[PDB]
C-alpha cells in the first residue's frame, strides 16, 4: 500500500519540515493513517537502522534517504505531467508509489530528458541533485516565501503562487479546484484577511482553504 | 526487494510458460533467489487464495484469476520497458531490472497514456508480445531446437525475461547483434545439453542450452 513504509516515514518527516511543522508520532499516524502501535514499532525499526533519532529528527543517512525519495517523487511528477501526459490531479498519487522503485540510474536519464529540472509541476524544489551529481542542492524552505494562512492572518494581500506541498496533493478533488480557479505555480492570487477557512481568489474565481491546507501553500507577496 | 511477492510468483509461472519450461518450485527459487521453505509457504498460500493449482506432476498451473493478474503485471512490465528504451533512453541491458520494480506500482490510467505516447506498441523492446491490451481497453522456433534440427539462418524475434536478468549477457548479445529484428546464423550442434554457437552481424557468441532455449527466432 505505502510500497515502502520506512521511506514513507522518512519522507513524511521531510514533508512536515518543508511545511514548517514539528515532526511528532501523532502527526505521522494522521498523515499515513497508521495506528499508534504501528508508528512506535516503525520508528523503533528506523532508529536501529540509523535513519532517525528534545521531547523526531532525521540522521545524516535518513536525511539523504528522505531527500533521494523526494527527488525520485518530483522527477517522476515532471515525467508524468511533461512527457506521459497524466492528469495534474492524479500525478502525485502515481509518484507516491513510483518514488520507491526508481534507481539513481533512471533519475540521471530523467534529469537529461526533462532538461535539468529544479522544481516539481507543483512548484516544490527537487532536492539531492548534488548527491545524484547533476545539479545544485536546495534549502527545504525558501525564507522569501510566505504561507497563505500567515499572509491571511497578517491582513491578506495579493501574492504569486510558488509551492503546493505534498500534503495538499493527497486530495485530487482539491487539486482540481485549485487548477480551475487558477491557484497554480506562477499564477497571481488575492488572499483575503481573517482555525478559520482562508478565502483565496484567482483570475477565474476562488475557493476556501482549511488552515492546514493554506499553511502548506507557499506564495511570494507582491 | 521483489516489491510485490504474489505478483512476482504469478509472473514467474507465466514467464516459465512463455519460455516452454515446466513450472516447478525449484524454477521459482532459481528465478526469484528465494529459499525452498519460502517458495513452498508462498505457493501454499496462493493456492488457498485461488491463484494457482498444484498438479500430481508437482507442476504449478495458474487459475483464470492468477493468469488475469499475471497478464496485468506483464503488460505494465513491457509498457514500462518500451517507455524506458524508446523515451527515457535507459541502457538496453539495464531496462528489465528497472521494469521489474515499476511493473508493481503502475496504474491502468498511466498504461493507457503510455499506449498513446508509444503509438499502440504490440511488443516489448526485447520482442515479447504485450498481453491484456484488450482488458486495458484500447511459426516461431527456439535457437536450441533450430540448432539440434541442423541450424540455419533465422531472424531474432524474442528474448525471454530469463535472459534479461543477466545484463552482462544482454551486453554480449547487443555487441554481436543477437537483438530482435536482426538475422543470425545458428550453427548445428550434435549433443543435447551442449552450448549453441550463434553468429551475429558483428561477431559470434556461445549460448548455454538454457539461454538458447529462452531465445525464439523465425527461420528463413
Ligand atoms: Co507530490
Ligand atoms: Co510513497
Ligand atoms: Co523484461
Ligand atoms: Co517485478
Residue numbers in the entry:
A (entry chain A): 3 to 55, 58 to 59, 62 to 200, 204 to 231
B (entry chain B): 3 to 140, 150 to 231
Can I see the authors' text?
We determined the crystal structure of Co2+-activated IdeR at 2.0 Å resolution. Each subunit consists of the three domains typical of an IdeR protein, an N-terminal domain containing the DNA-binding wHTH motif, a dimerization domain, and a C-terminal SH3-like domain. Two metal-binding sites are formed by residues from all three domains, coordinating two Co2+ ions in octahedral geometry. The overall structure of SeIdeR is highly similar to the structures of IdeR from M. tuberculosis and DtxR from C. diphtheriae. The structures of these IdeR dimers are very similar to the DNA-free dimer structure. DNA binding primarily causes a slight shift of the recognition helices, which is necessary to allow these helices to insert into the major grooves of the DNA.
